């Protein structure tokens, strides 16, 4: 109702930064980002893995198939996979050996629901190694794979362009 | 008092942190173990860095009749 929320710097106290303006916390945006690992950890990291792997997947094509080293390819193995089924691989363990900055070793299974979560002190960590595996495992099958319905898709193309 | 409109539906209000969408499409355990080996992650990565990376580079560099540098 007011001048802009009940008028506030942060959630509350103004001695943390964030300076909650728009581009920070407008219900216009903060909702376009929470089926995913923004505010709350839906299911485990397991599945988010491939919507992450894949979406980021079929990117990196025209970038290295239309800006390729010697470009505009007449090789049936480009306009897609070619090599770049390398980036996802050079980075699908650029990750795993960051999940060695996570250990904390468990197995609860709580991607099923119980009592309206919070994950409470959900900030900080509170996602152990046996989590960050099933994500960067979802990443490989999202990366490699997400590279082929790029490639596999023929290419019916819009262009020029001026 | 007409423009005292008793806030034309309060809302409740604050929808919530409460509940403006259900969740994630039911597509899941349609990958259960499907693509395991990072879902048997129980000691690996050393395997995928000789394997994958000896076949992004073994045949990847070699070639039977150049098309040279």
């Amino acid at each position: 109702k007011p001048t802009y929320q009940v008028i506030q710097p942060l959630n509350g106290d103004p001695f943390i930064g964030g300076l909650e303006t728009p581009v920070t916390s407008s219900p216009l945006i903060a909702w376009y980002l929470s089926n995913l690992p923004a505010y709350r950890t839906a299911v485990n990291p397991l599945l988010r893995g491939v919507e992450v792997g894949l979406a980021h997947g079929f990117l990196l094509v025209g970038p290295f198939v239309k800006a390729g080293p010697l470009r505009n390819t007449e090789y049936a193995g480009a306009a897609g996979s070619l090599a770049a089924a390398g980036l996802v691989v050079i980075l699908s363990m650029c990750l795993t050996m960051y999940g060695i900055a996570s250990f904390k070793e468990g197995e609860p299974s709580i991607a099923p629901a119980l009592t309206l979560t919070g994950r409470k002190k959900q900030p900080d960590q509170l996602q152990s190694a046996d989590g960050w595996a099933k994500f960067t495992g979802g990443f490989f099958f999202g990366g490699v794979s997400g590279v082929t319905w790029a490639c596999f898709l023929m290419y019916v193309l819009d262009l020029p362009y001026y | 008092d007409l423009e005292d409109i008793a806030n034309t539906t309060g809302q409740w209000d604050v929808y919530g942190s409460d509940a403006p969408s259900p969740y994630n499409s039911l597509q899941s355990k349609f990958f259960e173990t499907f693509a395991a080996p990072f879902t048997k992650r129980g000691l690996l990565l050393k395997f995928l860095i000789l394997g994958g990376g000896s076949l992004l580079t073994y045949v990847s560099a070699n070639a039977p009749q150049d098309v040279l540098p």
């Binding site: 050996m97 900055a101 | 860095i49 580079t57 073994y58 560099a61 070699n62 070639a63 009749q65």
Partner: peptide, 30 residues
């Protein structure tokens, strides 16, 4: 077979590095 001695620049200049930039991220942790 004909003309094929190209593996001792990736195994070194490329893959050997992979090992250590991975591996030696032992300086961070192991």
């Amino acid at each position: 077979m004909i003309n094929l001695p190209s593996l001792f620049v990736p195994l070194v200049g490329l893959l050997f590095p992979a090992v250590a930039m991975a591996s030696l991220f032992l300086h961070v942790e192991k």
